[PDB]
Design a protein around this ligand. Structure first.
Ligand SMILES: O=C(O)Cc1cc(CC(=O)O)cc(-c2ccccc2)c1
Ligand SMILES: O=C(O)Cc1cc(CC(=O)O)cc(-c2ccccc2)c1
Ligand SMILES: [Zn+2]
Ligand SMILES: [Zn+2]
Length: 591
């Protein structure tokens, strides 16, 4: 293995030879440990509170999930405890027959995914435009510097030679250029999967990339119309740790559809950075803090460019195999068989594959499957064998499906069908309200002015206006936050990193206008394009469901908060100062 990772280690060794040592009391058991060097401690056990959001959500000061979220350990200590739990494990190798089905399926799936599209290289200008639009920190400074691009070019020349010298994953500009240069080279070779929407619903049938949270529920409702069994949504315990060498070799098959110059660069990314990796991990010691240099041949690097698309791909493949087992196409004898006949797998893929893909909604490790009947619940031999062991359930207990698409969990959410006063139906995203309020009350990082804090608060309030307007508490808090923040202040910083976020709330444009555009105008499931002229016509969940999903409506503390919210708004305003404010409270029935 040192023939592939050695050059990278040699450069880390030399760059930090002042503090380089082999700590013989390191915790790594499955990962290969190379050495350590001293560093300053990064992250805290707590997180900065958004005072604007906190001031306008007083009843949630006494809510356990809200308090819990105000913590989250990002220190070298917290990073080490989470590591040994899942990261430091080995997945048993799938059986020869299972490996054969996976290979047949992967081949078929890559050819289906590339039927209309062709792989291509992504560019310096695409990555530059991306780093610009996302920042508008030290990434934009590197992108604007020609010396960064000269180093990228040097690293690329090693890749074309089949060598790597600076592509290191993490769990000032010297190493920062080597990291951002590694991410650019990965984007150049594999970015087309994201950039050209290989996992969009139209291209992949199962995929949902580029659809958006507001479309996921409509997608789940459409799957529920397909005849078959219950809807299954099993979670895998630590998906990224369960990605085997066999999975990596099946994902690699996309290189076969590439142009020679592209194939050469993607093959270098796969073989030198996915199938062989050098990882930097922060660890505390009695002498201080160190950065450990570790390596392994399998698992997925969680923050990489290809990660989402490749997990979506491998999950679609795994779910097709489980459907095949559910249908009796694959038996126990077949999975053990090193000479299993391809014919029946190919036959099933060629005649039923696409129809079977349409029964699923897959986003990385998140899946929803509506098989042709419920034999799927007990079809576990292949799923467990492939290494995709389901979370918090005995390996062999049958899965439990849902007979109502509204009860189905997907991408940290569930979805409700709402009937508007005008009789039109909406399908909306929802989740427990404490998770929503608890996140909104946290400001990412430290050293933030009341200005930046108020704008992030406005960002969260406008996100709730567009996605979670059907929650009474969130509509009230959203109107209170927007009443307290000056009108012309542009929401800055993101509310979420979700690939399902289109950030339509990052504007000073009227939120009812934006709501109309998302839910009425551009909504393919909204046949009647009549606009909603008032927030009073934007529906709420029924009171009961609002309560079942964490609402405080009906509580005295909540009625006291609602009645006295203009006072709290006025307090934030007096602290912000002499700015122009709009009172958004009259857009509500209450005021
Ligand atoms: O990132 C977070 O803090 C929580 C979170 C999670 C998810 C689900 C997932 O991507 O895993 C989705 C969204 C989201 C919200 C509004 C619009 C679009 C997406 C937010
Ligand atoms: O049900 C509706 O359509 C109208 C509606 C709106 C609101 C939002 C607001 O807080 O002003 C709250 C409540 C509510 C119900 C029971 C107890 C406490 C509040 C009802
Ligand atoms: Zn490299
Ligand atoms: Zn709900």
């Amino acid at each position: 293995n040192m023939d592939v990772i050695g050059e990278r280690i040699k450069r880390i060794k030399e760059e930090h030879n002042s503090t380089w040592h082999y700590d013989d009391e390191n915790p790594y058991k499955t990962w290969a440990y190379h050495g350590s060097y001293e560093v300053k401690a990064t992250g805290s056990a707590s997180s900065m509170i958004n005072g604007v959001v906190k001031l306008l959500t007083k009843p949630w000061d006494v809510v356990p999930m809200v308090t819990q979220m105000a913590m989250t350990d990002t220190t070298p200590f917290g990073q080490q405890r989470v590591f040994k739990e899942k990261v430091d494990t080995r997945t048993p190798r799938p059986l020869p027959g299972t490996r054969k089905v996976m290979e047949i399926t992967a081949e078929w799936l890559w050819r289906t995914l590339g039927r209309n599209k062709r792989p291509r290289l992504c560019t310096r200008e695409e990555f530059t435009k991306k780093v610009r639009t996302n920042a508008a920190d030290s990434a934009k400074a590197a992108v604007e510097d020609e010396e960064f691009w000269k180093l990228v070019d040097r690293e690329r020349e090693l890749h074309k030679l089949g060598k790597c010298g600076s592509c290191v994953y993490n769990m000032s500009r010297a190493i920062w250029y080597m990291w951002l240069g590694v991410r650019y080279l990965e984007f150049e070779a594999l970015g087309f999967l994201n950039e050209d929407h290989w996992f969009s619903r139209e291209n992949s049938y199962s995929g949902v990339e580029g659809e958006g949270l507001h479309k996921l529920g409509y997608i789940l409702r459409d799957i529920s119309k397909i005849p078959g069994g219950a809807m299954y949504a099993d979670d895998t315990a630590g998906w990224d740790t369960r990605i085997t060498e066999d999975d990596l070799h099946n994902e690699e098959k996309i290189i076969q559809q590439m142009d020679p110059e592209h194939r050469q660069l993607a093959n270098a990314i796969f073989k030198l950075t996915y199938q062989n990796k050098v990882v930097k991990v922060q660890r505390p010691t009695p002498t201080g803090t160190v950065m450990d240099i570790i390596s392994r041949k399998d698992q997925r690097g969680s923050g990489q460019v290809g990660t989402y698309g490749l997990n979506t791909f491998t999950n679609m493949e795994a779910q097709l195999v489980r459907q095949m087992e559910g249908e009796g196409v694959l038996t126990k004898a077949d999975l053990e068989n090193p000479h299993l006949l391809e014919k029946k797998i190919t036959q099933w893929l060629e005649t039923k594959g696409v129809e079977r893909l349409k029964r699923m909604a897959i986003s990385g490790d998140d899946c929803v499957v509506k098989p042709i009947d419920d034999r799927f619940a007990n079809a576990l031999l292949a799923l467990n064998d492939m290494g995709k062991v389901r979370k918090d359930i005995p390996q062999w207990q049958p899965s439990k499906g849902w007979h109502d698409w509204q009860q189905v969990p997907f991408c940290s959410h569930h979805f409700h069908e709402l009937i508007m006063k005008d009789g039109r139906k909406l399908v909306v995203p929802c989740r427990p309200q404490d998770e929503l309020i608890g996140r909104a009350r946290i400001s990412q990082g430290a050293g933030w002015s009341l200005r930046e804090t108020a704008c992030l608060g406005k960002a969260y309030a406008q996100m709730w206006s567009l996605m979670y307007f059907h929650r009474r508490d969130l509509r009230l808090a959203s109107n209170a936050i927007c009443s307290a923040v000056p009108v012309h202040w542009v929401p800055t910083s993101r509310t979420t990193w979700s690939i399902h976020a289109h950030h339509q709330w990052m504007t000073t444009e009227d939120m009812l206008t934006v709501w109309n555009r998302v839910w009425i105008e551009e909504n393919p499931w909204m046949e009647d394009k009549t606009p909603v002229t008032t927030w009073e016509n934007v529906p709420y969940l029924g009171k009961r469901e609002d309560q079942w999903c964490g609402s405080l409506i009906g509580l005295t503390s909540r009625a006291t908060w609602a009645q006295n919210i203009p006072t709290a708004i006025q307090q934030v305003r007096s602290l912000i100062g002499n700015e122009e404010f709009l009172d958004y409270m009259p857009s509500m029935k209450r005021f």
